C-alpha cells in the first residue's frame, strides 16, 4: 500500500 505514482 505504497502511494501510487501520478
Amino acid at each position: 500500500d505504497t502511494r501510487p505514482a501520478p
Partner: antibody
Amino acid sequence: VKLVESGGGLVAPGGSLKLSCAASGFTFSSYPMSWVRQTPEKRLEWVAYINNGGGNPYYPDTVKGRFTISRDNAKNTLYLQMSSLKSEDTAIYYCIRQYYGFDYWGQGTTLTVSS
Amino acid sequence: DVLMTQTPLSLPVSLGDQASISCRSSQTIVHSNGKIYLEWYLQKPGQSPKLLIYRVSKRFSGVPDRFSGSGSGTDFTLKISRVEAEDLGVYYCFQGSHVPWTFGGGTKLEIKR
C-alpha cells in the same frame, strides 16, 4: 537514511536556480523522490515527483513548465531546476524519499526570489 | 484540485488529555485502485515535517501507538490519546489519491501547563 539539500539562496525575479540533494543510507535507484516546499506562510505545497528510474516527472500546474526534476542515480543526487522564478516561489524546499508517503525529509534549503 | 480543510486551527490540550484533529476534503479521495491515500504529518518547531500515518490509519515506522487515524468520505480524523510535550507542533493532513497532491493548512497543537 539521510537527505541533504543544497543550492538555496537569493535570486532575482525571472531568474533561474538549481537545487541538489545528497542521498545516503539506502539504495537511491530503488525509490521514487519528491520535492515539497514550505512558504513563509508555513503552507506546504508539493512541487515535483519522479520515479525511481528518473521517469514520470510530474508537477502541479503552479510550477509546470518552469521547474524540472531530475536525478543522477550514479551520484545519488536529486536535482530541481527552476526558471522564470516568481515571488510566490520563495520557500524552504525539502527533498523527500517517497514510498508509503513522504517517508523521509531533508532539513531543507531556502529559496528567496527578491530584487 | 482537492481542497483539504483542517479543524480546529489551534488546539490547547493538557498532558495526558486527548487531542483530535479533523480534515475535510472537497471531494471523495478514493484512488482508481479503490484505496484512500490520506496521510498525516507533524512538523515540530524548527524541524522538517515527519510522516505519522498513511493510508488513512496506518502508522509509519517509529510512530507510537497513541497516534490513531480514521475516516472515509470527506471526513478524516487524527487522534492523540495521551498527549506528551514532544507532540507539540503543526499537524498537516494530505491527500495522495488525486493529482495534484494537496496538503491541509495545519492545526497547531499547544500544551496546556
